[PDB]
């Protein structure tokens, strides 16, 4: 429920609230593709999918696991950004460019 609370400047970094939502739909439309592959024909699906495809993997077996080991909101968010990079900046429509120029 809560989340658009306790986020933003002076409490945490100010790009947090934003970088949520991007990811959300991104990952979303990844698996979404993977469904339809198995129906008509895998490579009969839109070519500008294959990246969004691979993007689902990264968040997948690259990120989620982290075994046992202490983590930090800092170290987290750092690699939270890592996620975005591969997909263009011109495809990130739920975040402003200032934080993009904060990092990439």
């Amino acid at each position: 429920r809560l989340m658009n609370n306790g986020v933003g400047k002076g409490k945490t970094r100010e790009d947090h609230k934003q970088v949520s939502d991007q990811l959300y739909s991104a990952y979303a439309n990844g698996v979404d593709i993977r469904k339809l592959v198995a129906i008509i024909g895998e490579d009969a699906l839109t070519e500008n999918d294959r990246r969004y495809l691979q993007f689902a993997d990264a968040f997948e077996r690259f990120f989620i696991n982290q075994g046992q080991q202490n983590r930090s909101i800092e170290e987290s968010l750092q690699i939270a950004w890592a996620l975005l990079s591969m997909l263009p900046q011109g495809e990130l429509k739920r975040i402003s460019k200032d934080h993009i120029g904060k990092y990439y």
Binding site: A38, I39, I40, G41
Partner: protein, 210 residues
């Protein structure tokens, strides 16, 4: 929008599962056959094709002792040996979605029988059509088969999946939905009946003792 009915339908939707479950049991191995038969054709296709395709040019391109610039003369000169450019015997054959038609034309193409004496190299060079053309007809009926068998294969397995991870687990959930819903109703039974007892006896120990 609606849920189901409420009873008996349990049994019917069970025979829904029977229909599905068993149906899809066999639904693969319908296709097992066709995939089986498929390999032979995959093998067969290019064999003669590659061989005489290369042997068409063999002399053809390589006998231009006149034939290239007097190719003009000869090529004119011996042109249209038998060019109907037709032969269609249209064939229909089992293919899903429409039994697609295939066909063969069947007429010559030239090779040592062509009109007039004329030079010698010519006729043999003309012979080459047997080995591009005639032979190339083989792929005209085999190469289409690959795609046709594709259609089936694909479409079929397409359903396998769907059935297997859409239909079945949903209708699975149908069965449940009934089940429990029947059950909680059955509480009421118990409770109502429950109350009846308390009364019948509570009432009666007062007549002979009070």
């Amino acid at each position: 929008s609606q849920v189901s009915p409420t009873r008996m339908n349990l049994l019917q939707r069970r025979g829904q599962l029977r229909l599905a479950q068993k149906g899809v049991d066999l639904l693969k191995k319908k296709r097992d056959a066709l995939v089986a038969e498929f390999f032979g054709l995959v093998r067969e296709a290019m064999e003669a094709r590659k061989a005489l395709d290369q042997a068409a040019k063999e002399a053809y391109a390589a006998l231009l002792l006149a034939q290239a610039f007097d190719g003009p003369e000869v090529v004119a000169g011996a042109a249209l040996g038998v060019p109907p450019l037709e032969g269609v015997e249209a064939e229909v054959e089992n293919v899903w979605g429409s039994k697609v038609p295939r066909l063969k034309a069947t007429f010559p193409d030239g090779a040592l029988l062509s009109p007039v004496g004329t030079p010698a190299y010519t006729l043999e060079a003309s012979r080459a059509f047997r080995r591009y053309a005639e032979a190339l007809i083989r792929v005209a009926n085999t190469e289409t088969r690959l795609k046709k068998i594709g259609e089936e294969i694909k479409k079929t397995t397409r359903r396998v999946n769907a059935l297997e991870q859409v239909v079945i687990p949903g209708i699975r959930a149908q069965i449940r939905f009934i089940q429990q819903v029947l059950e909680q109703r059955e509480r009421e039974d118990t409770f109502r009946l429950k109350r009846i007892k308390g009364k019948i006896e509570a009432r009666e120990a007062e007549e002979e003792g009070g």
